[PDB]
């Protein structure tokens, strides 16, 4: 407890609180916009999924993790990564893709020799169908004839909650050629090729649109807390500072008096 | 009926129906 150190700490916490309150407001803005654009996206994405649940798809006999590049959003990344390692283990060949640098840095080292591609520039600007199409294209143009894949992301629920979820990618044009698909006739073996490609971009887009909503609401929340903790810390250090300031003077003065009286 | 793109080419599906809309030759065709 040195008036010097105390002051050193106050100095760095007052800035933290400032930068942290700023980051909160920016996020809450990004979140607000994201929450809205998410309304349509769900209906659209849930629509894309309307075919497969409405009618079975399994697989006889690619893990995609989505998040972002920026941290300071609680456990957005660690969650998907956690579930990502879980799959790769329980499993059949293993190959992976990470959208958002954070995934490529987290569920990484242990599994680099288990990578296909990775994506950057995710999260700063709102995601687009266009970005999803790049991800899809990049995959189709890959030598990985994946038979089945899963997409792991954070499904928004509220500003104070989200849930890491998984979505099956039976994109296997081959798998979409099972018994259950006998109900739908007048389907060229290659009309599906177009159908699957498309529904692949839709699912990547959906996860992407859910992800930024979860991310911006969690960064907002995390930065609200951080800022409030900072201020509290500020209030305490200040009060600790004054107690110390008063005791040093008193202490230094009693010392002078003692010496003087002894004479 | 569900029809959407951003807003609520592409695909169409009849099971409930859902319509989902998002080199020179292709461009010509579109224009």
């Amino acid at each position: 407890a040195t008036l010097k150190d105390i002051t050193r700490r106050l100095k760095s916490i007052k800035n933290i609180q400032k930068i942290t309150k700023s980051m909160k407001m920016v996020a809450a803005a990004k979140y607000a916009r994201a929450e809205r654009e998410l309304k349509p996206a769900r209906v659209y994405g849930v629509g894309s999924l309307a075919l497969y649940e409405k009618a079975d798809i399994k697989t006889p006999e690619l893990i995609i993790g989505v998040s972002s590049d920026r941290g300071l959003c609680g456990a957005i990344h660690s969650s998907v990564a956690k579930q990502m390692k879980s799959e790769a283990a329980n499993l059949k060949e293993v190959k992976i893709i990470g959208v958002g640098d954070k995934i490529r840095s987290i569920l990484h080292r242990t599994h680099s020799d288990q990578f296909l591609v990775t994506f950057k520039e995710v999260g700063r600007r709102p995601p687009t169908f266009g970005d999803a199409s790049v991800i899809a294209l990049e995959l189709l143009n890959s030598g990985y004839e994946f038979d089945e894949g899963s997409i792991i992301f954070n499904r928004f629920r509220s500003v104070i909650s989200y849930k890491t979820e998984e979505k099956p990618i039976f994109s296997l044009d081959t798998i979409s050629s099972a018994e259950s698909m006998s109900i739908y006739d007048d389907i060229d073996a290659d009309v599906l090729r177009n159908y699957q490609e498309y529904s692949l971009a839709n699912i990547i887009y959906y996860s992407l649109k859910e992800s930024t909503t979860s991310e911006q609401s969690a960064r907002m929340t995390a930065m609200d807390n951080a800022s409030k903790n900072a201020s509290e810390m500020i209030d305490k250090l200040t009060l600790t500072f004054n107690r110390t300031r008063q005791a040093v003077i008193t202490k230094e003065l009693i010392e002078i008096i003692s010496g003087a009286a002894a004479l | 009926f569900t029809f959407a793109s951003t807003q609520v080419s592409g695909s169409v599906t009849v099971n409930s129906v859902q319509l989902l809309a998002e080199e020179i030759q292709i461009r010509i065709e579109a224009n």
């Binding site: 994506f119 995710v122 169908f129 266009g130 970005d131 199409s133 189709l140 498309y198 | 592409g10």
Partner: peptide, 28 residues
């Protein structure tokens, strides 16, 4: 197709005729 193009790419062109690009590749 046969020309190397895929369908997403077709949809891309068609949709534009009638849309970000932030994403960046990290291939290693």
């Amino acid at each position: 197709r046969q020309a190397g193009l895929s369908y997403i790419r077709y949809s891309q062109i068609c949709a534009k005729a009638v849309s970000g690009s932030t994403i960046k590749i990290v291939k290693v």
